[PDB]
Each structure stands twice: as structure tokens, then as C-alpha cells.
Amino acid sequence: KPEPTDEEWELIKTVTEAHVATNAQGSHWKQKRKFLPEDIGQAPIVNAPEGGKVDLEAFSHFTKIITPAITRVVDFAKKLPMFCELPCEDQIILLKGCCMEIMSLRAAVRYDPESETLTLSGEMAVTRGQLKNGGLGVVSDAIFDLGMSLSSFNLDDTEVALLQAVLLMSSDRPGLACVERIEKYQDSFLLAFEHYINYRKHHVTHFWPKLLMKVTDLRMIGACHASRFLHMKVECPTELFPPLFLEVFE
Ligand SMILES: CC(C)c1cc(Oc2c(Br)cc(CCC(=O)O)cc2Br)ccc1O
Numbered sequence: 493k494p495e496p497t498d499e500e501w502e503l504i505k506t507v508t509e510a511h512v513a514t515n516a517q518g519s520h521w522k523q524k525r526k527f528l529p530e531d532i533g534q535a536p537i538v539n540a541p542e543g544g545k546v547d548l549e550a551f552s553h554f555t556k557i558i559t560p561a562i563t564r565v566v567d568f569a570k571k572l573p574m575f576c577e578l579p580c581e582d583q584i585i586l587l588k589g590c591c592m593e594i595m596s597l598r599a600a601v602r603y604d605p606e607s608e609t610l611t612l613s614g615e616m617a618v619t620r621g622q623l624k625n626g627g628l629g630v631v632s633d634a635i636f637d638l639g640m641s642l643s644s645f646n647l648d649d650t651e652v653a654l655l656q657a658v659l660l661m662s663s664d665r666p667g668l669a670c671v672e673r674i675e676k677y678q679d680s681f682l683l684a685f686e687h688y689i690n691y692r693k694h695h696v697t698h699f700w701p702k703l704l705m706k707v708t709d710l711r712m713i714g715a716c717h718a719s720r721f722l723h724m725k726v727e728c729p730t731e732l733f734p735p736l737f738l739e740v741f742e
Contacts, residue, residue: 658682
């Protein structure tokens, strides 16, 4: 079980700092978080079918905080030398492809079993129902279940940062030009990640294989969100969609 090489530590230091600098965690979330009033997302008539409707008030609060979150994903990627050297067209495709995947991971690692909330951008704590009714539908359930599941992993900033890099460098996104180059970058991240894991010595058998399953869960959330986005455009007024929100998931 090899630990990271000297070159891998350099990479690790790079991605970790990149993540830390864009994860909005200077003044830790547990203390900074405000709980979205229970009133918001609350259905007035219990017996009216939920169907695929969207709570527009909840939706409004979410699109308000989502833009600065989207920008942090971009800044994260833009702090990686490998990414920066990719053609702009590929950069765009990779960002549109992993944006939700990374934001969902960042929210999932901030799951709180006490209140049963996910803390978004380390500032707004929301419940399963709020995020569900507010527009995500079952994707909210997926993110919360993932959050619950990660709680025992004890993932540090390096491991979260590495997961983000792996998702960022996905050569299977439709339309990519530098497929080979992107895959090579992912392999380098994957390898450095596996070695960091061995170095960490987590007390759990097959931790690496299990971590990889979480990446798969995030890929599913990402794609499922693309679908839920189309529904939002149909259920919500065009005015509640910020230009950045549209540009990234268009
Ligand atoms: C607008 C609709 C409901 C909507 C909501 C939505 O919820 C989130 C998540 Br899962 C994470 C973060 C940031 C986490 C962070 O970076 O700390 C912010 C937000 Br608003 C994601 C996509 C989407 O289309």
C-alpha cells in the first residue's frame, strides 16, 4: 500500500489549498449557519397532492444563494494548473458537467444529524423537505442520503478536494476535445487520491472501493439534476432564474 510520491504531495497540496480557498470555511459553518425558517417550504394544505410542483418562495431563496456557490466551483477549477491549460471550450463543458456534482458534495459533507439539515455555502441550513419542495425533488433525497452516509467517513479537506478534482476531470462529458489529456489528469488525481488514502489508514476495510461508490452517487445526482432543471424551467417563472444559473445548466 504505497503512500503518495513527492510529486503527488505537490498535487495534493495544490488541490487541497484550491478547495480550502473556495470552500467558504474561514469562519466554520456550524457557527455561521442560519436555519432557513421552517415556514419556508411548508405546504399550507396538507392534503393537496405534492406531484412535481415547486415551492416558488423556497425556489427564490435557493437561486439567490446558488450563484455565489457556482462561482466558487469555477474558482476552484481555475486554481488548478492542469485545468487552466485546457481549451476554453473544454473548460466550459467540464464545469457545466461537474458543477452540481461538486456543490452537492460540499453540501453533503456539511450534513448535521442533530437538526437534519445540509448547510449550503456554510451559511444556510435547510431540511430535506425544504430543498425537495424548493425545486430539487428526489435529488434532495439523494443528497441527504449521501450526506448521512458520509458522516462516518471523516473526510478531510484533502479527500474532499480530491473527490472534486476526480469529478472535474471527467473525460466522458459530451463534446470534449482533449479527452486523452483530461483522462490522464483524472488518473493522476485518482492515483494520488488512493495513495493519500493508504497514508491516512482509515479504520474500515475496502475504504477506497467504498469511496468510489460515493463518486458514482454524485455522478447520478449531477445527471439527475440536469433533468430536474428542465422541470424547474417549466414550473417556475423565468424571472427567478439568474443568468449564471442558466449559463451553467443550459
Ligand atoms: C435552484 C434549485 C432549487 C437548485 C438548488 C440546489 O441546492 C444547492 C446545493 Br445542493 C448546494 C449549494 C452550495 C453548497 C456549497 O458550495 O457550500 C447551493 C445550493 Br442553492 C442546487 C441546484 C439547483 O438547481
